[PDB]
Amino acid sequence: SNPRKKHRED
């Protein structure tokens, strides 16, 4: 696999 990186938007 699922994402290598994750962005935090809230």
Next chain:
Amino acid sequence: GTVNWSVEDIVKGINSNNLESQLQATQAARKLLSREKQPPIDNIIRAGLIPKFVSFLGKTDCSPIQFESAWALTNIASGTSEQTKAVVDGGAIPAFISLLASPHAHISEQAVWALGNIAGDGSAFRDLVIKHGAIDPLLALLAVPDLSTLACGYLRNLTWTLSNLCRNKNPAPPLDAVEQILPTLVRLLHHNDPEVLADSCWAISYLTDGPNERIEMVVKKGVVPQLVKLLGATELPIVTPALRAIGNIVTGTDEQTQKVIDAGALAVFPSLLTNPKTNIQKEATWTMSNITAGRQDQIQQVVNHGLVPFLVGVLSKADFKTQKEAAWAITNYTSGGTVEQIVYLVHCGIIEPLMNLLSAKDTKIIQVILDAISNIFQAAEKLGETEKLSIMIEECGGLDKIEALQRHENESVYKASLNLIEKYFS
């Protein structure tokens, strides 16, 4: 108040010598970096703000600016490799690791997230995070009697970041780091949250994607029965990594493969080989091909579980990449099986769908199929039944294909065809 600041205004506040003004500007940078459509990561980097964000991580007496800069740096680190490198280059790794022990759960969680983005960039940054000492404080956050007392989002972020420390392959993570992480991973694999379960399976799938000694470290921890259980889950985000882990394990030794069979995995494959998601069907059939590459007693377990009709099924109708895995599964079967097991294959109707696939343009699937037919013909010679098979191959239009493959660009395909014609069709 902090909504839609210009980068110039953010720089102005961060460069003031007023901690509250710096806090306000940092939050404004966080909100800018938080938007979905093209957050201006590069503009923020070019303004030289990363060193200031990193130094704010250390401001223990102003926890809000620790949080806001941790969030801002997390989202820069979520971008391209170059953008993640800018965060690393600013010294963020030891500063984020120091925040793992923060008494503010939301700050500790944000540092977990940021290290997951850095580690998730690739093997080098993964191993750099490990060298700075992240694993011990990460695992200490999960040293509780019952995982269910931790906040759900917090536990999910910890699990996801741990899986990035298990991820990537050139090189694989350090052996001692994997040994250090595995007992906590095994415990997460028994948690009841579907996201924790999915990412725990992903981590295990990464760790089993390697040589047999890597597989053995996982298999020795006793996780195979739990992986088989998760293989039967109704949540596709759990089945997919569980299946990839199981498929990785059966690429190991026959003994490691046997632990998958012993755990009951084959009883799930009627569902998996007819699963509506085509990549489950493909992964399940690839897994079957590595099981039919095993000992005759393992081929026999495939037979007993009624899985040969399902292999006939995917060979008859499936997306083409699944049919290729099925062809491999059949040739592996015919290469290692007994005469009786090979005869049973024909009785299930392998011949006609196998011949139909000889029309494919994939040159290697034709080599694979030609090998299977040669193997089946060899079993037929031991029973004096070479003809009955020849008539069967010709009655379904097969002989036309092999006699037509007497005109192929690949040399080995041409020669394998004419030999079959020469020896069994005179």
